[PDB]
């Protein structure tokens, strides 16, 4: 079924186009444990994040083939879909690098 291929700590954000500001995903400020899940049977991937403190799901988005993953900084990465821009503010450079690596692995399978 769903296999986690990476676990990283990051604050999930979404971009507020109008106010030109990033806002906490799910409106819940704080860090989340973010996984990239590989659905073995369907061979599809998705990013899922839950708040570290209360486990609330803040992000659950598919990773489509061709996705352009941008590593804005050493600790902030982002990507988008037709509706919004997602951003991950990692708890550390190590968290960012490992997540980026897993994303590239997922994209290698998709592309």
């Amino acid at each position: 079924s769903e296999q986690s291929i990476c676990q990283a700590r990051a604050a999930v954000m979404v971009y507020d186009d109008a106010n030109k500001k990033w806002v906490p995903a799910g409106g819940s400020t704080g860090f989340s444990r973010v996984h990239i899940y590989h659905h073995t049977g369907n061979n599809t991937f998705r990013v899922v994040g839950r708040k570290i403190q209360d486990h609330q799901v803040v992000i659950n988005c598919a990773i489509p083939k061709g996705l352009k993953y941008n590593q804005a900084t050493q600790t902030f990465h982002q990507w988008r879909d037709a509706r919004q821009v997602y951003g991950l503010n990692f708890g550390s450079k190590e968290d960012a690098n490992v997540f980026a690596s897993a994303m590239m692995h997922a994209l290698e399978v998709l592309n």
Binding site: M13, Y15, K20, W22, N70, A72, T73, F76, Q78, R80, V85, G87, N89
Partner: peptide, 5 residues
């Protein structure tokens, strides 16, 4: 993409 935080 928009600028980071």
């Amino acid at each position: 993409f928009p600028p980071p935080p």
